[PDB]
């Protein structure tokens, strides 16, 4: 039940990416409970990127986020967290190893295909950011063969 | 630039097809503009399967669209609303074609996967219905060598 | 609940097929209710050919079935007999359409890697035949997703 | 020819991972040695896990094991004992790597999908319990690409 | 033994669906005897598409074969021209089926994706034409499990 | 712009690995600049081997490169050489990891499937040496959303 936020950037969207890194977290076994393509104004970009404020890569990451499309999603699933972070790969696309969506795709930081939470903190803050409407729920008929008990 | 609504069914929402039946029309070369996960409620449906009120199966479709959540999609390409349900498949499982989306996964015609619009008429309304919102619009930089001229 | 027999033939084998075969049925919805790796005896070939032993190319098809082990399978679901043929394609592999099996992978009629049985009554005699064991039952959670009522 | 024992859980065949992970293991080179499709009995269950009877969660395992069919098989090839089960990935979900079978399929230790042996020891004695009857036979055509000598 | 030219155009190039074509006639079980990444230029074009010289979109053709490189190649199989053509799909879009090279891939029937001979006399043409240099020769381990004597 | 040299061994092209091989590095955002289907001479195989001239396995080397028909590539991005090498996996089998190409695919060291140059210093002997002839030159639409800036 634990639930983190997984965003594909604007050159996951351009590059074609959408279909197949939902597939990873489909397949993983994961529970897709929030889900919208969006453009992002520069308001909502600043808070979400707020934790870099003073950074002098700051305004770089706003200018890029609202350049394009972004896919917002919510999963839920045991050490989803963690675990969603794993599949995406290391932060730098290149360090990242073959099998997950940054070493299969991506080559540079600053198109790096996609976000996730690095905390149940800052996924919990994520989560109230993007989604304020909340989640579409609903129960999985495969839980009992993906989860034990 | 033509528009159609298609929609994943809570059948394929739960069977774990979200990912792969997005990939197939970004592959196609079509644009997605609108993406949404959604609990559909009674009037809603209602709005939505109109046309088929006064059929003796139009409870039957309402109660099924309202018992799991739906995946909302607009995409956009030449021909996109035909081309699209041809890549959708026949209703009938006996009809449907191998390598089409209903072909590869759907057995029943009452677990059809996901529905696409019959028209461009029928799509501007079904676009209107589902995103009032509005669409997230972009520019492929691949629009060169997916289209001439 | 229609059953119908899939015989995966030895070339299907050689040529490593198998686990894309499989996927292509479990993909579909198809339940697999039996399922065993086998090397083929002439006797038993003639029986399981019985049909067509007045023909001249009878000797030809036993002898192709008893040159190297092939995967027996009974797929569970409705009009999977018929369906099955669909998905396997045309016996020429030359008229066999992209998308189904001998149309992606076969170019000759006597290697067409895959066979399914032609008809409920076929079906029938050729499940009793390979698997008078009988077959594994279960009851797949995914049921009410993949079939109406 | 060294061989090892790998079984497809109850979980794997529920959620439709059957032929996926037959072609793993296919297009690494291995050869499919033996296979079938078996409900499992309750005492043949407890031989099976005899080596973890004095531990805790083992009445667990074996209340699981017969709770559906699961798929026995034998493959054969050069290190295809450690090989399979770097290919299986590690047995906690949570550490297994992008691009094994665990590492993109699960994430539950009490549903991690499939088994290998442990040790070519394990496996002659796996292979004893589980197919007793022995192998089928027979020899790739691709034997000298795959294998120098 | 017959042979057919297959050449990728520009947009396949582009669009990331080399290894993809190459992919679906490795699988068919036909033979790659010649594989060439060439920039085309004006005059060869010319040459290239000299039968249509007289109409008037020869200019056209022109000038988008040399906006960025191909893959040239021939195939080598039974009935490989016309088998060649299937899998590539019509030439209109709103024609090609699903499961086809042009059905999954491209919208727009001047960004079609691929070339195939559309005859015997036109392929040893155009393999004259791309490959005077003649092709590299080899005899697959798996010709007995794809061909029948 | 960086480049390194890639070439699929006998085995790689006897195996049907071509297209899958291609799509890995095109789906990581790599610019292939060279592709040619070669039967290697001997005169040539002791060059491209020359570094082992005084190893006691090189005349086994120059005897196994010209038994088959290698794929000779370049490809061009950040860091291409060593990613190159990461996507190809370890040197042996037995340590390659399961998303990398020898992870999936090979089991002998003498059948690795595929080489990688080892550094930019061989990458621009190798490709000096394969391509004589040059690269082919082109520019990705899609580089801006592969690459910062």
Known sequence: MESTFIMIKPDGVQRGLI??????????GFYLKA???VNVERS???????????????QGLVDYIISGPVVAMVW???SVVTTGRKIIGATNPLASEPGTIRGDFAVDI??????????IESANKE???????GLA????????????K
Request: proline share 5%; no cysteine; aromatic share 16%.
């Open 35 to 37: 889900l919208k393509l």
């Open 44 to 58: 909502f970009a600043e808070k979400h990127y707020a934790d870099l404020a003073s950074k002098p890569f700051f």
């Open 127 to 133: 989560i109230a950011l993007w989604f304020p409407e």
């Open 76 to 78: 839920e699933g045991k």
């Open 110 to 119: 600053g198109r790096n295909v996609i976000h996730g939470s690095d905390s």
């Open 19 to 28: 279909g197949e890194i939902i597939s990873r977290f489909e397949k993983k």
């Open 137 to 148: 729920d609903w129960q999985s008929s495969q839980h009992p063969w993906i989860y034990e």
